[PDB]
């Protein structure tokens, strides 16, 4: 009962720092405009760092889509999955509120909300988020698959660079959600909810798709009883 | 029987995502033009992520030149190599078509086709593509060599950064093909095939040179008794 | 013992040399070079790969703290004697000032400029900046403590790269606010060399509180030594 | 004997081929500035990932020195023989010049320019520039020796990445002063081809001294090899 409390708190604190660091690095600084790579690196090294410190303790989901994917694959429980999703949403909003307080009334701007950019249709954007989240779930599972043992190597860095890869592309299209908590956090704080469902339907479908493809298509288990 | 089907499917899906993520990051130029480093990182972390996710299930070739190199020292049969190459070509075109469908209308432009740049000669570009793929194949052979030391496991990041290294140079000339599928995918969708042979002869020759140099010159692998037989029977 | 004595001397010398090279490389790469002004990512990579390289090269000799805040976090957390912590902090402060003085005598007077001093930026306030420095150093110690946690024996992992990228992560954000300190020696070094002590306490109070918070959170909240023999 | 052995031939050839590919890729990615001038980070990454890739691919065959300074550092740290060290230095110098001549041929005359020669920049003094190169190569040799230290447990690829990121780190600083050499072969290769030898000694004394300094500090001061058996027994009880 105590280990479970530590895991839910860790998921909360992890999502707090990820959203706090991610958005804060994505704000429009006029003296040094953030590059697609700069933002991608911030989100990328963010997940890699948080996976290293807490991955072995709770799994370092830091993402409701990852938690849902883990719910379809990993022997996680619906109770923990709910407590995790709840912890991620609380940590994210807490990270966005903390950043808002410290960010002045000049940089804040859109507070790096994920927003449909370069017009683009919701169907085209929702399709990207699906493929963006799918590749992350495939990597996370392969990097953490116990059947591989210690053979996968650099788990934190691979997962981290996988998030960065999505961002290196996603920034230009949407912003690279891959995480409903990272999307909801600035939307609640700075009132902006333009097609928010896109950043929810996409990732959730992409995560379940990646989980089913991995756990039951690409590398399924042997037959049970 | 199933494992082979899963492996061929993985090679298809891997090349799809690589081309989808790679080209999409190399075009898209509004008021944020992608830099050489930005593009190199996109292709590099792409392969690295896909080698990590699918390496243990198929080998994550994602490259016909890599599949050809593995035909000499990866224990890959010509049957698997063919099924892999076919899966890579289908995945790439599928990745470019999927990207094409979603592209923001009149944005595609070249669609990040590998193209001769800065008035250089076709011979100079084909020489680069050879060296770009030779160093990659050299790195893949060592990274997948049981005798390379360390502990069991494949370094997906090392392989990924090898692809990125090639882009830091190839981009200035072409786009760092190293992969005939990465070149054909946007060439088929758009229709631009200007000097398409450069993006095929270069990588294939560079890969075979690196594969022969590693398995016969640099670090000749340990032959099994059964493999050593075919050498004696091949002579006789 | 005798060989036990030298080992400690090697550790103190390594902590000195590590902080010297870190400050020398970090500040030198952060200077406003006219032909190529460094970007936030460019600077983040210089400080990031700096710690990662020094942790890789010297971690197995001294622990490669290169930071008084992490040394203090190890006192409450990875419980180390105050003797080593003092010798380490002293070695870091001497190496840092030596690294900033060496760079000064290495850079042309014209390009020297602000010598990459930590300074309040974008008209920020001391209270907001001290809060940022806290969260920046907290995530670094959290990563260090987990990457070097005795309980993480078997597989070596990637502590150097993870810690290195953890420093870079703090720079991708901290640079815009304070230039990212996370280290009282990196802040004091250019302040002593080039007299600029504007809000120096921010670069000291912030990191130290963030490090102790991260050390207490890890050793007492996140993954403590379970007092009960049950597990 | 060590000379007439396949392993020695493979190691000398590996050092040649490694320096060939490193110089070819390194200079070519750092000089190609037509309508897209490379940034300091871009150049640092090219040289960094260059060394990292070659150490991964060839490290197990020859040690992947790719540098006469590194080769000398291993000589000082009692590993490689003086015979092998000489053959390695010769292989590195031959590979480098071959890489620059090949790049010249493939690079259009309009963009070749100075061919990314290592040069004292922003009117730096010979004493200050030689001091930077010293500290640049010193940290690298410290990382290389630790990345190749059998006593340090590591996962596959990380040592090559650590060495790679060490080279990048050097370039992130050295570029502003000298263009970052750390390698006499990387400096000599374009100097012979293009013909610019102004104060070439800075790019040789600096790295050579930095490598020996780092090697002596590591093998004798910081982390010497033969320690004692019974200090571990005294740590126990």
Numbering used by the authors:
A (entry chain B): 6 to 230
B (entry chain C): 6 to 241
C (entry chain D): 2 to 232
D (entry chain A): 2 to 238
What did the study's authors say about this model?
Aquaporins are water channels found in the cell membrane, where they allow the passage of water molecules in and out of the cells. In the kidney collecting duct, arginine vasopressin-dependent trafficking of aquaporin-2 (AQP2) fine-tunes reabsorption of water from pre-urine, allowing precise regulation of the final urine volume. Point mutations in the gene for AQP2 may disturb this process and lead to nephrogenic diabetes insipidus (NDI), whereby patients void large volumes of highly hypo-osmotic urine. Here we describe the structural and functional characterization of three AQP2 mutations associated with recessive NDI: T125M and T126M, situated close to a glycosylation site and A147T in the transmembrane region.
T125M and T126M are located in extracellular loop C, immediately downstream to an N-glycosylation site at Asn 123. T125M is located within the glycosylation consensus sequence (Asn-X-Ser/Thr) and this mutant can therefore not be glycosylated. Consequently, T125M is absent from the plasma membrane when expressed in oocytes. It seems plausible that, similar to N123Q, also this mutant is kept in the Golgi, after which it may be degraded via ESCRT-dependent targeting to lysosomes or the more recently identified Endosome and Golgi-associated degradation (EGAD) pathway. Overall, T126M gave crystals which diffracted to highest resolution, (~3–3.3 Å), followed by T125M (~3.7–4 Å). The T125M and T126M-structures are highly similar to wild-type AQP2, with root-mean-square deviations (RMSD) of 0.942 Å (929 Cα-atoms) for T125M and 0.322 (940 Cα-atoms) for T126M. In the T125M structure, a minor displacement of the main chain could be observed around Asn 123 and Ser 124 (1–2 Å), most likely due to the larger methionine side chain. It thus seems that AQP2 can accommodate the replacement of a small polar residue with a larger hydrophobic one without any significant structural rearrangements. It should be mentioned that, in particular for T125M, the resolution is not high enough to reliably obtain information about interactions between residues and that there may be minor structural alterations regarding side-chain conformations and hydrogen bonds that we are not able to ascertain.
